[PDB]
């Protein structure tokens, strides 16, 4: 499984979301697990997305941190199993 | 107060931006979302946590009916769901 995971902090606003789906979207890039958990005490929230490994993934990386919701990108600084293990309980 | 909206969805690209897109386009924020593939299909689930409201009866057609939504159900998922997730994450 050649899957990286993206974990996003973003703002917590009506929209942020379809933005950065939006442009997985243009570049018809399937995002396979989604979590999105709202960070306590702030305006923020933690999108994490799990995508296949792609050769465009860097300018997309770059691209998802120049949105103006997106105060930061990390790649592969998750839990690598972590869809693994909330899948267990939720399937 | 919060309810989980669950949907069937078919796991191809743009389909969360057309789900998101419908409350994107009210202002209406979500408050957590789950994604997961379906194994063995080419569909994924959605569980999306946002507040209960009258807006969302209206929302909750227009979300049927989108091409990709397979089927949409709603508050038949405990909304702590994700507490027990959130436990375990920065
Ligand atoms: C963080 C994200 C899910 C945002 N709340 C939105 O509704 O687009
Ligand atoms: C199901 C959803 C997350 C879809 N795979 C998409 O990329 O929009």
Redesign the pocket.
């Given at each position: 499984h050649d899957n990286v995971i993206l974990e996003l902090t973003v703002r917590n606003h009506p929209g942020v979301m379809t933005h950065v789906?939006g442009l997985?979207?243009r570049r018809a890039f399937?995002?396979?697990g989604?979590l999105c958990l709202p960070i306590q005490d702030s305006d923020k929230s933690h999108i994490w997305l799990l995508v296949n490994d792609d050769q465009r993934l860097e300018q997309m990386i770059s691209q998802i941190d120049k949105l103006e919701d997106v105060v930061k990108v990390q790649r592969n600084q998750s839990d690598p199993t972590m869809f693994n293990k909330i899948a267990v309980f939720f399937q």
């Open positions: 789906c997985f979207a399937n995002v396979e989604i």
